[PDB]
Amino acid sequence: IIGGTESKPHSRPYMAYLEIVTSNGPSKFCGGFLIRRNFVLTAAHCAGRSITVTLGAHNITEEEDTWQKLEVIKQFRHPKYNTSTLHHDIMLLKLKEKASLTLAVGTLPFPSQKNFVPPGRMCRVAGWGRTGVLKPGSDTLQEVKLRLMDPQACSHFRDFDHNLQLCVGNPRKTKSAFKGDSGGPLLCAGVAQGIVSYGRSDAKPPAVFTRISHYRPWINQILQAN
Ligand SMILES: COCCn1c(C(=O)O)c(Cc2cccc3ccccc23)c2ccccc21
Ligand SMILES: [Zn+2]
């Protein structure tokens, strides 16, 4: 998160810190969010050979009783996820066991309504991602309030599509999700509407988020079947 504030500890109890293993490089990290006691939603580009989820974290360097380190038993990457266009950048993670509900750990279920969110409003995104182009990932959960932009603001992302994705962050500000915030939720009035997907290497906003409303059928399909 660039240009944000430190989250009040445990104030976003659905946040998941993902450590992603690949066969041919060191660990990579993403965010995500707990939508059922045994399911975390995140970005498809966060897939790997195996994933661990840490729930209940604030400072991810300091173990505490709120932590739940949970094994992922299966990754459900969107079947149409495209590494060229980056369309359909969404994935569900099934946890081996259901998480414990605590003050620090809880689900964020979707409301019944899946209305298309138009441009104009402010939403908030949280993550442990980098705090600048040349800055490592934050030890502490950070968050930032960003403007939903009209889709034309994201035209320079030539594979952006307004139906599929939200355009997030006023270009006049530095405030932005960034690398390592991948897979984290964008909440608009307390409701998850986006998932951090991608942006510019130089961190100039806006960035592109998966538009959750579009994937609500797929999400439901996976959850009901598993
Ligand atoms: C998990 O990393 C694999 C490589 N990778 C990364 C990454 O962090 O390098 C991202 C995320 C990303 C990259 C560039 C700029 C961004 C600005 C805002 C938010 C996210 C951004 C990403 C997206 C799709 C596919 C592969 C990707
Ligand atoms: Zn704590």
> 10 an active-site residue?
no
The residue nearest atom 27 of ligand 1, judged by CA position, is 45
Residue 147 has phi, psi (to 5 degrees) of: -90, 130
**Residue range 1-12+108-213 in CATH 2.60.40.10:** no
**Whole-angstrom distance, CA of residue 100 vs CA of residue 116:** 32
Active site annotation includes 182: yes
From 198, 201, 204, the mutation candidate for ligand 1 (largest count of ligand atoms within 8 A of CB) is: 198
Rg (CA), the chain: 16
Helix (H, G, I), strand (E, B) or coil at 148: strand
Please give the C-alpha separations between residue 189 and each of 152, 160, 175, 203, in angstroms, as whole numbers. Answer: 24, 24, 19, 25
Write down the catalytic residue from 7, 58, 78, 89: 89
Residue 219, helix vs strand vs coil? helix
Start and end residues for every CATH 2.40.10.10 domain found in the chain: 1-12+108-213, 13-107+214-226
Write the class of the CATH domain 13-107+214-226. mainly beta
Residue 17 phi/psi, 5° resolution? Answer: -100, 120
The pairing of beta strand 50-55 with beta strand 91-95: unpaired
CA 56 to ligand 2 center in whole angstroms? 8
Dihedral sign for Cα atoms in the order 121, 149, 193, 72: negative
Strands (E), the chain: 5-6, 15-22, 25-36, 39-42, 50-55, 68-77, 91-95, 122-127, 130-132, 135-137, 142-149, 165-168, 185-188, 191-198, 207-211
Solved with: X-ray
User: How far out from the chain centre does Cα 201 lie?
Assistant: 18
* Tokens standing for residue 137: 């990932």
Q: How far is the CA of 36 from the centre of ligand 2 (A)?
A: 22
Decide: helix, strand or coil at residue 91. strand
- Rounded CA-CA distance 125/195 in Å is 9
- Count of alpha carbons within 13 Å of 161, Cβ hemisphere only? 9
Distance CA 119, CA 133 (A): 27
CB neighbours of residue 77 within 10 Å? 18
CB atoms within 10 A of CB 63: 11
